[PDB]
Amino acid sequence: EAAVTQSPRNKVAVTGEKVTLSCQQTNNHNNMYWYRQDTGHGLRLIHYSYGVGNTEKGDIPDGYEASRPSQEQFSLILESATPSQTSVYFCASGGGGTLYFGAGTRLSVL
Amino acid sequence: SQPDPMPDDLHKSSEFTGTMGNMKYLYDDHYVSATKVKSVDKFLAHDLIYNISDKKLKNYDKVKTELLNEDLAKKYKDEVVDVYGSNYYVNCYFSSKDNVWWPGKTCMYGGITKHEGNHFDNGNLQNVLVRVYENKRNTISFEVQTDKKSVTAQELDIKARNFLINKKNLYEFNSSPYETGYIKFIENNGNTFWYDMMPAPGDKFDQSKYLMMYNDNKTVDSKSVKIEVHLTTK
Ligand code: NA
Ligand code: NA
Ligand code: NA
Ligand SMILES: [Zn+2]
């Protein structure tokens, strides 16, 4: 099984639409993370979580909320999608000296 | 009767720079509830473990409730009780190591009342009035309901905050519309006590440490108790 599954893998949204990205891990790590990729650069942290019912702000939290309702699931929420949020998004789960990534979500906000 | 709060006694949301969703989480459609249960285990002298299954998601099948001390735990250990309280998972532990995941388990404080003789004479509910003040003005009032004659302050508090999250955005994901807030209970005998509703200053919010205030298992008479919520803005 894939250590981390993301859904959707591809998304086209209209400006002002509510978009939710799901990340499902299978290793039940305490820590989960949502990143967006700076095109041709690095990953930028949006929100992360230390466990169920916890979320913390990363380096670029504005425009996004997050939810950790269970050990396996970490959701990223764009309450009102803006064009600047067009990007590739990667979820990760980590713990016990491991860090796994999802295969990425391409989101386009027209 | 506890001394009433001075503005310097109250936590300010403007001084909390973390995620208010972590406080919201504890009160927004969130609680453990079970009827007619008896404890099955303990971790430490002051705690009790119950077989209670999650009725929202499937996150747990056992609940550890921590009491103030071992004598309070001994009060309830072999009793048939009902349970109602706010549960947490981060730093929910059953050994000396802090960050261990304990699958199938959740943690809370207090929330226990004897079952027998504690219900109204027809499965009926008791209303408890909550008066809400915003900048000293009573702008909104509502009732919370309980099946219990003697009900934990914790249960009433959770019900009030859940309502106020929904109707007044008491807590939002980032911050709160309110600067300060406290919930005050007024008992028939004149006794008063209150809890600070806002997180401690800084970046992190320690859910376990916040909820520890409920460990006294304080109960009130639902038929006669009064509740006031006092909020200030900005
Ligand atoms: Na009792
Ligand atoms: Na919100
Ligand atoms: Na917010
Ligand atoms: Zn009962």
Side-chain angles (χ1 to χ4, degrees):
Chain A
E1 211 176 7
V4 182
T5 304
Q6 285 175 228
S7 184
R9 298 287 328 274
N10 293 271
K11 184 71 186 297
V12 176
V14 306
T15 297
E17 194 184 329
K18 187 186 170 153
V19 182
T20 296
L21 306 193
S22 298
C23 172
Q24 205 192 290
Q25 58 157 334
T26 58
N27 294 125
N28 285 303
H29 297 306
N30 277 339
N31 302 332
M32 295 185 76
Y33 303 86
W34 264 111
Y35 292 95
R36 65 178 290 181
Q37 196 162 55
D38 264 20
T39 72
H41 299 86
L43 293 178
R44 300 260 62 205
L45 189 60
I46 304 173
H47 286 290
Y48 58 110
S49 167
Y50 285 110
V52 176
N54 169 269
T55 76
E56 299 295 348
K57 286 180 284 194
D59 299 300
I60 83 275
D62 303 347
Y64 296 95
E65 303 181 351
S67 177
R68 185 75 183 275
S70 68
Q71 190 76 343
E72 62 274 12
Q73 173 63 223
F74 190 35
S75 301
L76 186 68
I77 302 101
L78 293 65
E79 220 75 50
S80 181
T82 66
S84 60
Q85 296 176 311
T86 297
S87 194
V88 190
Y89 294 84
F90 288 92
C91 178
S93 74
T98 77
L99 181 70
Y100 299 113
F101 291 91
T105 289
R106 296 174 180 193
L107 170 73
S108 52
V109 189
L110 20 81
Chain B
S1 204
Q2 196 180 358
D4 257 24
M6 229 57 251
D8 74 86
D9 292 319
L10 300 173
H11 288 154
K12 301 179 198 341
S13 73
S14 58
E15 296 176 349
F16 174 71
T17 57
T19 295
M20 191 68 77
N22 294 324
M23 170 73 84
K24 185 177 179 190
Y25 175 76
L26 299 179
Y27 294 98
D28 181 2
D29 189 33
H30 177 81
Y31 55 95
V32 166
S33 187
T35 292
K36 221 164 155 42
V37 295
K38 202 162 158 289
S39 70
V40 300
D41 206 356
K42 303 168 50 64
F43 164 40
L44 297 168
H46 68 275
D47 72 58
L48 294 174
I49 297 171
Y50 290 86
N51 285 333
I52 298 165
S53 283
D54 192 5
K55 284 289 179 298
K56 233 84 95 299
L57 299 167
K58 299 104 156 90
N59 283 330
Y60 59 88
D61 49 64
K62 293 191 187 280
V63 174
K64 171 169 62 109
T65 187
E66 277 185 76
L67 300 143
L68 186 58
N69 62 45
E70 70 170 358
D71 286 310
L72 195 46
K74 277 173 184 197
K75 181 172 180 179
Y76 296 108
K77 180 188 154 63
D78 290 319
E79 285 296 307
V80 174
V81 298
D82 303 326
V83 176
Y84 194 108
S86 179
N87 57 300
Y88 64 94
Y89 299 92
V90 169
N91 294 342
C92 174
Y93 60 78
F94 297 72
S95 79
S96 74
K97 220 105 211 198
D98 327 14
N99 298 30
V100 177
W101 186 47
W102 290 87
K105 294 178 179 44
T106 195
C107 287
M108 60 175 277
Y109 295 92
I112 309 303
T113 50
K114 305 292 171 101
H115 171 89
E116 301 162 64
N118 200 43
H119 298 284
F120 293 97
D121 314 64
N122 252 110
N124 301 358
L125 301 171
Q126 172 65 53
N127 297 305
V128 177
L129 177 65
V130 179
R131 293 179 221 268
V132 181
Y133 297 79
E134 301 178 84
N135 300 310
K136 297 189 186 180
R137 300 167 182 274
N138 178 203
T139 55
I140 182 196
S141 301
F142 60 104
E143 296 86 36
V144 294
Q145 304 188 290
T146 182
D147 56 351
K148 300 176 186 85
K149 298 186 149 85
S150 179
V151 60
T152 59
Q154 181 177 183
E155 174 169 341
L156 295 183
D157 191 9
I158 287 41
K159 284 172 175 185
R161 296 201 211 185
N162 180 55
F163 191 89
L164 263 357
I165 295 297
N166 285 333
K167 296 296 179 195
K168 302 287 297 189
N169 299 321
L170 166 65
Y171 311 118
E172 298 179 305
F173 180 81
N174 191 54
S175 188
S176 167
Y178 303 106
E179 176 65 342
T180 67
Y182 66 93
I183 187 280
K184 178 174 176 184
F185 293 87
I186 320 288
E187 301 189 80
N188 196 29
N189 62 8
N191 184 54
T192 68
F193 55 100
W194 62 271
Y195 308 130
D196 193 333
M197 297 166 78
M198 289 300 170
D203 228 40
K204 301 283 161 156
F205 173 60
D206 186 332
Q207 286 161 335
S208 180
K209 183 174 156 71
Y210 182 76
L211 295 166
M212 182 174 302
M213 66 179 186
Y214 292 138
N215 72 175
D216 63 0
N217 209 80
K218 168 72 179 162
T219 56
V220 297
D221 175 62
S222 63
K223 170 57 97 73
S224 67
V225 67
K226 302 164 61 144
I227 295 69
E228 303 177 347
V229 173
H230 296 261
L231 309 172
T232 66
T233 55
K234 292 159 301 170

